[PDB]
Amino acid sequence: NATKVAVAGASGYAGGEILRLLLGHPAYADGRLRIGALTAATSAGSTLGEHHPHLTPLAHRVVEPTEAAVLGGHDAVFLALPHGHSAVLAQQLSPETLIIDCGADFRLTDAAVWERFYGSSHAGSWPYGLPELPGARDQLRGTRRIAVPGCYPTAALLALFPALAADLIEPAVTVVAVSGTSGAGRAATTDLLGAEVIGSARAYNIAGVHRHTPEIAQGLRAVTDRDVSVSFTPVLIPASRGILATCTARTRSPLSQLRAAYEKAYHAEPFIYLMPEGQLPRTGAVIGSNAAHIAVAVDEDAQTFVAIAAIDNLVKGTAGAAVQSMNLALGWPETDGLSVVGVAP
Amino acid sequence: VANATKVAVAGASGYAGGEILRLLLGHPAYADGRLRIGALTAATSAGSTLGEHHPHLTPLAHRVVEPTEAAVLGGHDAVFLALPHGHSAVLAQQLSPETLIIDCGADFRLTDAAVWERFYGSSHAGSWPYGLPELPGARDQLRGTRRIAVPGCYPTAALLALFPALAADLIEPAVTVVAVSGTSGAGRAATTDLLGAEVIGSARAYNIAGVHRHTPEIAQGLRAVTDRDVSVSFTPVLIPASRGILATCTARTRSPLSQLRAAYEKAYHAEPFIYLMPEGQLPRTGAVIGSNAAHIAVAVDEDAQTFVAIAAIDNLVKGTAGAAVQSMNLALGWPETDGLSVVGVAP
Numbered sequence: 098n099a100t101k102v103a104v105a106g107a108s109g110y111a112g113g114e115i116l117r118l119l120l121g122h123p124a125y126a127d128g129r130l131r132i133g134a135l136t137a138a139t140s141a142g143s144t145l146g147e148h149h150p151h152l153t154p155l156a157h158r159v160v161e162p163t164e165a166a167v168l169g170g171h172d173a174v175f176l177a178l179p180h181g182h183s184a185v186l187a188q189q190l191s192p193e194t195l196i197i198d199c200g201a202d203f204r205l206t207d208a209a210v211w212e213r214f215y216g217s218s219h220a221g222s223w224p225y226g227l228p229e230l231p232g233a234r235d236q237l238r239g240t241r242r243i244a245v246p247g248c249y250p251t252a253a254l255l256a257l258f259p260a261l262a263a264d265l266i267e268p269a270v271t272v273v274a275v276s277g278t279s280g281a282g283r284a285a286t287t288d289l290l291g292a293e294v295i296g297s298a299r300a301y302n303i304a305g306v307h308r309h310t311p312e313i314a315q316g317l318r319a320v321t322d323r324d325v326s327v328s329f330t331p332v333l334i335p336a337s338r339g340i341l342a343t344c345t346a347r348t349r350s351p352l353s354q355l356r357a358a359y360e361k362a363y364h365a366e367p368f369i370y371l372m373p374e375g376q377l378p379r380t381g382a383v384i385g386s387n388a389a390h391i392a393v394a395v396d397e398d399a400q401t402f403v404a405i406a407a408i409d410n411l412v413k414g415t416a417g418a419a420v421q422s423m424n425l426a427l428g429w430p431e432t433d434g435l436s437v438v439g440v441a442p
Numbered sequence: 443v444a445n446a447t448k449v450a451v452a453g454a455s456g457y458a459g460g461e462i463l464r465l466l467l468g469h470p471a472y473a474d475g476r477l478r479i480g481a482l483t484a485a486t487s488a489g490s491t492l493g494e495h496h497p498h499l500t501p502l503a504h505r506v507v508e509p510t511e512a513a514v515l516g517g518h519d520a521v522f523l524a525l526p527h528g529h530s531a532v533l534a535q536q537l538s539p540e541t542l543i544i545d546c547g548a549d550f551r552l553t554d555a556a557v558w559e560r561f562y563g564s565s566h567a568g569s570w571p572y573g574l575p576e577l578p579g580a581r582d583q584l585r586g587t588r589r590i591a592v593p594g595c596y597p598t599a600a601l602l603a604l605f606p607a608l609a610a611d612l613i614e615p616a617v618t619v620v621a622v623s624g625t626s627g628a629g630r631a632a633t634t635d636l637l638g639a640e641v642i643g644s645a646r647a648y649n650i651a652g653v654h655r656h657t658p659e660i661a662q663g664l665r666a667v668t669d670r671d672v673s674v675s676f677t678p679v680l681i682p683a684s685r686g687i688l689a690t691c692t693a694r695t696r697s698p699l700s701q702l703r704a705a706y707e708k709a710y711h712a713e714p715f716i717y718l719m720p721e722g723q724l725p726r727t728g729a730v731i732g733s734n735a736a737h738i739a740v741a742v743d744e745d746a747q748t749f750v751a752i753a754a755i756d757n758l759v760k761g762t763a764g765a766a767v768q769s770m771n772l773a774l775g776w777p778e779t780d781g782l783s784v785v786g787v788a789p
Binding site for chain 1: 616618620622624639640642643644645646647648650651652657673674675677679681682683684685686688690692694724725726727728729731739741742743744745746747748750752754788789
């Protein structure tokens with residue numbers, strides 16, 4: 098009253114998307130939320146329009162250096178750096194400031210797993226910003242700390258958790274997830290160039306080396322008592338946004354039981370849409386929305402459960418999750434600023 | 443060995459037909475006068491010119507499309523039935539039986555009548571030599587054949603990715619394949635779901651959980667290399683590209699990576715179209731577009747006790763028309779690589 102919000106990493110894709118959502122948030126329109134300092138590690142002194150020409154209402158804002166002093170004096174701070182490490186910065190801010198970290202530093206609950214995959218000391222763990230996971234909403238209500246999930250784990254966990262929690266599939270899961278290129282971030286490399294990406298698909302970081310692998314495992318372990326294993330293969334495709342996760346696991350359960358488990362899990366979840374029978378998700382349908390579209394099936398011959406989930410990697414996969422969780426932290430309606438209606442075609 | 447081979451293409455106006463024609467135009471036997479391009483036919487559009495369907499094929503743009511009828515297809519030494527999604531048993535029966543008949547469709551691919559009837563809803567017609575020369579035993583069946591059943595595009599990628607590991611008994615026979623495909627694999631019949639505005643910027647799985655008809659075709663090729671009971675979980679995913687398949691293929695394993703790599707070396711070291719990626723490299727469909735190559739890498743996820751094989755092909759070349767031409771070369775006693783480059787057109 099009013100809630101003054103800073104965004105660190107404002108010039109990146111996640112930062113831009115948080116800002117897009119905040120501009121459309123009812124708390125912004127009625128004055129209860131103010132957009133304050135917009136910061137970046139380089140390009141201080143540049144204007145936001147130079148980075149985000151779609152954000153014309155903020156085009157004139159001058160980007161400031163990312164430092165604790167600049168971020169101080171805000172009620173909420175988004176650390177909009179999904180690929181960055183914000184433990185050092187986060188430690189300099191008050192426990193009473195709401196910090197929403199888009200990065201990985203506070204996602205994991207096992208220090209040994211952290212050290213193995215990230216090669217640094219474990220900073221700790223904050224409430225995980227996936228409100229639909231069992232128990233997660235309770236953790237987020239009134240929190241002043243949020244660790245936003247990775248984009249791929251968001252899709253895979255939404256696809257898989259209801260089946261595993263109901264003990265209807267085996268705990269060895271396979272996930273092959275296609276993703277648009279914005280999930281790779283805004284740092285220019287030759288491999289992310291348009292000419293390279295357009296008209297091509299490639300798997301990367303395969304066979305368990307992708308850092309989101311243990312993150313999927315952690316979310317699944319939380320809903321079962323069994324040893325979880327995850328085979329996760331990400332595939333870059335020629336789209337700017339979207340993740341379509343194809344998730345499989347062996348099953349002994351009939352389709353009717355699995356379908357019922359998903360209906361029960363998601364029937365009162367405003368962002369999670371279970372496809373009518375005979376329809377399947379498409380990433381095009383969710384772009385620009387905070388929705389996840391989910392369908393499930395059983396391959397009887399292969400004794401295999403198949404779950405498909407589509408999300409916008411930048412919305413439900415990143416910035417939408419961040420805002421959704423922010424709403425919960427602040428006691429605002431969870432759906433504020435977050436449409437379920439995709440911008441298609 | 444063939445010396446004058448006049449070729450017809452039935453279904454010339456579709457993607458497979460256009461690609462066969464592209465390859466024939468670039469074939470050394472075309473340039474030296476041994477391979478001659480005859481009748482080009484389609485079910486509708488007779489009287490139109492080829493350029494109205496395939497503006498890339500300018501040397502043939504003026505050719506007039508003829509009706510797909512046995513009488514028109516007569517007097518050709520080879521006939522490509524270039525309908526990957528069609529059923530050509532009826533037409534094939536009408537051709538002079540000495541003709542080299544190369545069917546891009548499914549009617550002669552499968553070897554189990556009950557499986558055929560289950561997935562295709564008709565009586566099994568039988569089987570012809572499968573046009574995937576790199577599969578164990580396949581090349582021998584193609585030499586001098588007058589009949590070729592061209593493989594489906596997805597089975598091509600999945601079988602190349604998986605067969606060496608399974609043949610060596612180094613992975614479990616329950617396999618998972620999630621394959622991304624450009625939209626040309628769905629064919630050229632105009633539907634809303636295949637419209638540019640729909641496909642651009644979107645990805646979707648389709649025909650999931652064992653309903654896709656390429657599922658039993660993958661199973662069949664795998665059953666040929668093992669005595670174990672094979673199962674296949676196959677999910678195809680359409681992505682916003684015109685061409686390419688990237689198949690991600692997995693199965694449980696407890697075998698060292700080095701033994702798996704040795705199986706791929708054994709299978710592919712003398713196969714000119716199959717490229718095993720250098721260490722630290724992975725396939726990309728961009729690298730094989732417009733080539734007859736498959737690029738393959740393998741890995742082991744130790745924590746998940748899972749083998750991962752990635753295969754990239756151009757769905758229209760190694761997945762369709764290149765397979766057809768490769769098999770044609772074998773049928774006619776011509777060098778297998780004739781007209782078929784391993785070099786992709788990238789970016």
